[PDB]
Each structure stands twice: as C-alpha cells, then as structure tokens.
C-alpha cells in the first residue's frame, strides 16, 4: 500500500485514524490487547486487521470509490462504531462513515463564501401523534432584506436514514452555499424532514405511510407561516433519494397545484395504470413541471439502473419531458446524491 | 434487582438496550460471540457483563445519580461506544451517554409549547486562522416579531467538550423554550461557542476572550436582531467554561451586566483563602464597583460534587462575603460534576436575566 495516508475529514478531534491514501484505501487502527480478531467492515467486505506487540490493531481496505461510505468495526463478534470518527445516521444506526476525497470534491467544500444557517425545528404532529423534527437551511443573505421572500426545496432521505442525512452526509448547506455564491442557483430555503410517518397505532415497517399528509398539512404550512417564503407552486420544489425519490414522486404527482419541480435520485411500465395513471396525460405532466429530473450512479447495483431505465422508456414513449444525470463511478451512496443535488438545484426557480 | 427496566430515552431508534429501572440501575447488552471479556464503564466503575449461550453479553450497573452520565464499553481491550445509544461530545470524544430520569426532569422536557430554532453557524476566525462553528438559539417568537430585538446569553461548555454540549446533553433550547413559554424568562438568544481558541500554529495560551469579544459578539449582533448594550448581554459557563467566562466578564465590565459560574470559579483548583487585593488582578478589590457592574452574579454547585469543587467555590464565596459583594447561590441536590447540575443551574440562572 502506498504510504501517503492522511487523517480523514471525519475523524474526531485529535484522532489520527482512520486515514485514507492516494489509492483510496482506508486504514483503521484500534487498541484491543486482549482481542482474538478485529476487522474493518467496509463495502460489504471484511478485512482482518493485524495486531502488533503492544496489542494495537492496524489494517487497510481495498481501494474504495470516491466519496462517503458507512462502515463499522468488528471486535471478536461485536459490531461497533470506530472510536476514530464522528457518527452518521444510516443503515438504521448511528455509526461510522469514511470520506474518501473525490476529484470534484470542491463543489461541497467549506469555502470562503457567505454561509447560510442550518436550523433545527421541533414540532408536534397531530397526524402521527408524536414529536417530529426537521432541519431548515436558510441562505446566507436571508437576514439582509427582511422584506425579501424565497422559494423552497423539500428534500428527502432514503430508507433507514433520517432528517439529518441530507445536512450531514449530504453536505446540503455547503452545496447550496457554494452554488448560491457562484450565482449558479437561486437563493432558496431547503427543508429536510423525516420520511417515516405512520398512524398513531402502527409501529410496523409495512404500515401505511402518511408522510404525504404530514408534509402537506403540517410541514409546508408551518414553513410558509414561520419563514419568509414564496408559496406559489412555481416557488416550491420537491426531491428525494432512494425510497425518498418514490415518496416525493407520489407527493408531487398527487399535488400538482403545489409543486412545479421534481427530482428523483436513484429511485426504486404501462402509463395507463402506473401510479393511478398520472402519466397518462403527457401534456398535463409537462405543464405541471418546469423541471422533472432523474439521477443515477453509473455503479449502482440491481435494481436501480433497471428502474430508471423502464421509467425513462415510459417517459420517452409518452412524450413527457425530463432531465437525466449520471454520477460517474458511484453507487447507491451519498456522493451520487450530493452530485445529483448539485446538478438539480441550479435548475430551480428560473 | 427490580425488573423495572425500560429503554432509555437516549437509545437509537429501535434499539432495546441500554435500559434503566426504578432503582436507577443501567442495563446494557451487546452481541459479541467470540469475546472473552465485555465491560460497562460507567460512574467511574467497570462492570463485567455476562455472556449467554447465543453469544450475547448482558450486565447492569449499581444505582446511578439522576441525570446524564457519559459511559463506554470495553470489548477485549477496545474502548468503544455502545451501539445502542445516540452519541454526545464530551470527555474528549463522541461517545455514549445514559439518561437516568430525574424527578424534576419536566423542566427540560419536550412540551407542547412554542419552540425556538437551534441554528448551526459556520464562520472563519482570522484570530485563530481556522474555521469555527457556534450554535444559536432564537426564541419561538423571533420570526413573528420582525421589529423586535432580543438580549443575548453567551453560554460556555467545560473541558473536553465543545459547542454542541449545551444544546444536546444540556438541553438548552428546551429549557429556554419552557421558561420563556412559562413567562419565567425573557425571550433571549443563546449563543454557544467553542471555548478552545489558540493563536495560529499554536496547553497553548487561550485567545478565546479575543475571539469572543472581537469576532463572535460582533458577528451575532450583526447577523441577528439583538439588543447590544452591556445590560442586554449575559455570559456564563460550566467547569472550565465558568473559569473562562469569569475572566472575560471581569475584563470586560462594559459589555456584560450578568455572570453565571456553574461548578467553577477562577481560583480553581485551590481551596485556600483568597486575597481580594491580588486575586484575579484585584478585579474584586472594589466591592462597590462589582456590585454596580452586575445586575446578576450567579454561582451554582452540586451537593455531591467531588473534591475540590466544593472547596474551590467555598473559598470564592468567603472572599465575596468579606468584600460585601452580592451574588446568587444555587445548589443542585444529589448531583455531582455532571450535566444535570448544569441544566438546573441554567434553569435557575436564565430567569434572572434582563429584568
Ligand atoms: Cl460534528
């Protein structure tokens, strides 16, 4: 392995490991002097670490794709976070992640530009009878012209993630900070809620979702009431990744009077029956949407490329306009969706 | 042991352990089929868990004091977070914490009241030549009242913590939400920064005072609708932060009219008598001037804090009493040098500000 390893940007303050080298290999290190086996569990592959005389374990992965990857350590059967990194919510857990620098990483860099606030908002939902929480990005100049109003993008995570995903893993505030400062995107709010919403009684993962109801009756009215927003349909966009792409498509198509932009990133056909035949009327769709956007990673596994393919095929045959973007050499992971957002946001509200 | 155990409120979604019973015992569980020894390190005590036939380890602590406690697991030598909990920054790491329900926990509860925003703010410091981050609480009515302006509390964490502490394990936004809604505290901003600040390229000397006075406060007063007079600005901290903010307050009497010291004063770690003439550059020499400077001077302490914190505060208080300098004193019953003590101190301190 090439020895130009450096601490990742995900490291806890003062922690030297994990590290990444120019081969995009990840090196982890942990002290466990009584352990029999210690492993790095990354990219669906287990790597055995090697123990030195002092009982310190060190090892490296094979080369990783650029960007962000969840991982964990295995210590004699214990699946645990790496004490070396900050933690992220995904795969149904708070756990470790590693950042492997990308060639285009500058578009989500922390730059010397005006930075918008990222705000936590707690609210009670009468529909779910539970406490909820969303995060809201306001652009840097939001506090300048106090008569000015802004459009809003509602941006949703995937399965087994939560409302913190887009803001942390997804670097949404930095992407928009940069796009806005560069004059590529209109100043906008971004609202990130939790796509899990069920009726009071139900805890089952196959229970019916009422996220559409929550977004339309509790979230959006609250945002438009509490922030200086433009609340017309041409001022409101919706998008999501994976499960969230499907959710937000459903919401957009069911509420044509309230969204004029849709973005489906790596979502998971007879236009007469599909989605209650909402794609039947090709003219109605093209009229609703100023922007209908589809995103995919070139390295995504089955079934995501197939899903997007069949969808485009239906679109093409129906004469429904859409924009399509492919993230090179990324899979069903966060860099794909960082890039999708970076390509999608500049199309909005123009 | 009373089998009263229920999932803690710090558990990750869908995780059954850790759990707490009515004895305030903490039960943890983790699967480690090949492990030889798994331990719970909590309250300064290591408890050996027991392994069952499915490779799963379970064990429980002694009764804990009420409130929030940092902890970790040990797995065959590896000091690791508990996969069962969300994580907190403290003790120099992101790691586990347990919440043992307090009898008065209602005051930091998530209640059906108007809720203010907690905002992340990133900024570059030319004094430290580094990127920094603070968190800002704005009151629930901040947006509704576009012409209204608000006073500001600057609130600092302890050693080996950071700008997220007061907001997360400190529950600052909920405490203020509740106090403000209850009409007990004036609607205010709370600004939570990182007490660590050093010169570029530098146990190094702190320049946090310079960063706070010359970069943060001007930034906040420039970006938010604040009242920016000394009588509209308060400062306070816990442990190390109590020390730092005392230094800052006494050096900058023309910018602060309120100080709060939670489990810490600047004579730390000494428990010996103070000389007002020389202590802290004689800033407490003129008792009359100090009494005029401060509308509120607040000291907090847990009744179960370890040596030397009680002795440190006692010596400071005796200095104060002798000088005839007034102060408010609050004791948190049955808590030590930990976050519930400081939650309670904020709850008592905040209602005294800007009145
Ligand atoms: Cl962080």
């Amino acid at each position: 392995t090439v020895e130009d390893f450096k601490p990742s940007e995900v490291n806890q303050p003062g922690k030297l490991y994990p590290q990444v080298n120019s081969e995009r290999k990840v090196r982890v290190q942990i002290s466990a002097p009584e352990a029999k086996v210690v492993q790095l569990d990354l990219g669906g592959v287990k790597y055995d670490l090697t123990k030195d005389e002092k009982g310190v374990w060190t090892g490296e992965s094979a080369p990783q794709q650029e960007g962000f990857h969840y991982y964990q350590l295995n210590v004699d059967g214990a699946a645990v976070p790496d004490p070396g990194t900050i933690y992220f919510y995904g795969a149904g857990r708070w756990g470790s992640g590693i950042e492997v620098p990308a060639h285009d990483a500058d578009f989500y860099a922390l730059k010397d530009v005006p930075h918008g606030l990222l705000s936590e908002m707690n609210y009670y939902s009468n529909l779910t009878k539970a406490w909820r929480r969303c995060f809201v990005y306001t652009p840097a100049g939001y506090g300048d012209n106090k008569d000015k109003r802004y459009p809003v993008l509602y941006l949703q995570h995937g399965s087994f993630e939560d409302e913190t995903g887009w803001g942390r893993q997804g670097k949404t505030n930095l992407i928009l900070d940069n796009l806005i400062a560069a004059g590529k995107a209109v100043p906008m709010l971004v609202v990130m809620d939790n796509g899990y919403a069920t009726k009071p009684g139900e805890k089952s993962p196959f229970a019916a979702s009422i996220f559409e109801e929550v977004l339309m009756n509790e979230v959006i009215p609250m945002i438009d009431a509490k922030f200086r927003t433009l609340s017309g349909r041409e001022d409101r966009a919706i998008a999501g990744l994976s499960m969230g792409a499907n959710q937000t498509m459903h919401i957009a198509m069911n509420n044509p009077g309230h969204f004029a932009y849709y973005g489906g990133f790596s979502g998971t056909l007879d236009a007469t029956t599909f989605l209650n035949g909402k794609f039947k009327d090709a003219k109605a769709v093209n009229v609703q949407f100023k922007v209908f956007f589809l995103g995919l990673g070139t390295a995504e596994p089955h079934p995501f490329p197939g899903v997007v393919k069949a969808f485009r095929q239906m679109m093409d045959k129906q004469g429904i306009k859409y924009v399509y973007y492919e993230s090179p050499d990324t899979a069903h992971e966060w860099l794909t969706w960082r890039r999708a957002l970076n390509e999608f946001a500049p199309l909005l509200f123009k």
Side-chain angles (χ1 to χ4, degrees), chain A residues 40-327:
Chain A
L40 168 60
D41 194 340
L42 174 64
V45 181
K46 289 174 189 295
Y47 305 89
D48 292 334
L49 310 193
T50 63
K51 189 180 80 89
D52 69 9
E53 62 284 350
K54 297 187 300 181
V56 173
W57 296 77
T58 311
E60 308 82 35
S61 69
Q64 302 291 300
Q65 288 176 337
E66 302 188 299
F68 178 87
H69 312 279
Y70 297 118
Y71 78 96
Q72 68 188 5
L73 302 180
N74 189 342
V75 181
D76 290 332
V80 298
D82 190 337
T85 72
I86 62 172
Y87 305 119
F88 307 88
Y89 194 77
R93 80 203 182 200
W94 285 100
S96 284
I98 186 70
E99 188 72 36
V100 175
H103 75 278
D104 60 333
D106 188 74
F107 82 82
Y108 50 84
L110 177 52
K111 302 198 187 180
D112 185 25
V113 298
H115 295 296
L117 300 178
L118 185 55
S119 302
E120 177 187 336
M121 185 176 329
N122 291 271
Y123 67 97
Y124 185 78
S125 168
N126 289 290
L127 296 174
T128 69
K129 302 302 295 180
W131 283 101
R132 300 178 61 85
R133 178 179 69 169
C134 62
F135 287 86
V136 176
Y137 169 85
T138 44
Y142 180 84
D144 293 346
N145 193 331
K146 288 165 183 162
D147 284 331
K148 183 163 182 186
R149 292 187 172 269
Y150 300 86
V152 188
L153 165 65
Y154 294 83
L155 188 61
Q156 282 306 127
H157 59 81
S159 290
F160 299 113
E161 294 178 330
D162 77 350
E163 69 275 9
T164 71
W166 266 109
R168 301 184 80 259
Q169 296 95 293
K171 296 177 173 293
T172 294
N173 58 311
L174 297 181
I175 292 168
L176 267 291
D177 282 347
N178 291 342
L179 285 176
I180 288 169
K184 287 181 169 185
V186 177
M188 66 178 80
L189 278 67
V190 184
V191 177
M192 292 147 290
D193 205 278
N194 190 310
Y196 291 106
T198 54
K199 296 187 185 175
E202 294 148 47
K203 215 192 226 168
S204 171
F206 299 97
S209 172
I210 57 168
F211 178 63
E212 171 177 349
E213 287 88 332
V214 171
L215 190 75
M216 303 302 303
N217 288 284
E218 295 176 336
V219 173
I220 293 173
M222 174 182 64
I223 296 299
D224 287 336
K226 294 297 176 299
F227 295 86
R228 281 181 278 117
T229 73
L230 302 165
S231 56
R233 57 183 305 278
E234 301 183 20
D235 309 304
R236 197 179 293 100
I238 195 175
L241 67 92
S242 199
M243 151 183 100
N246 287 78
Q247 292 185 285
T248 54
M249 178 178 291
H250 170 113
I251 291 167
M253 310 295 273
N254 271 341
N255 301 270
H258 300 282
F259 307 93
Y261 320 84
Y262 168 74
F265 317 151
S266 314
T268 182
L269 277 190
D270 203 330
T272 36
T273 67
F274 182 60
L275 227 299
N276 280 26
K278 287 175 212 176
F279 289 97
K280 266 186 182 151
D281 189 345
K283 284 183 182 178
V285 180
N286 289 335
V287 164
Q288 184 190 340
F289 294 106
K290 294 172 59 178
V291 178
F292 195 109
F293 178 105
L294 300 175
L296 184 74
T298 65
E300 296 207 38
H302 180 85
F304 302 107
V307 168
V308 176
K309 187 186 180 63
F311 195 85
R312 289 176 65 192
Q313 284 181 336
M314 178 195 65
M315 304 254 78
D316 295 338
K317 288 194 181 298
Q318 281 297 101
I320 299 170
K321 304 196 276 262
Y322 66 87
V323 171
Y324 178 63
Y325 168 77
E326 287 194 347
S327 171

Side-chain angles (χ1 to χ4, degrees), chain A residues 1-6 17 19-23 27 60:
Chain A
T1 67
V2 178
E3 293 294 335
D4 50 18
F5 282 94
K6 301 179 195 310
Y17 290 91
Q19 301 185 356
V20 187
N21 80 344
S22 57
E23 299 179 285
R27 178 175 281 162
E60 308 82 35

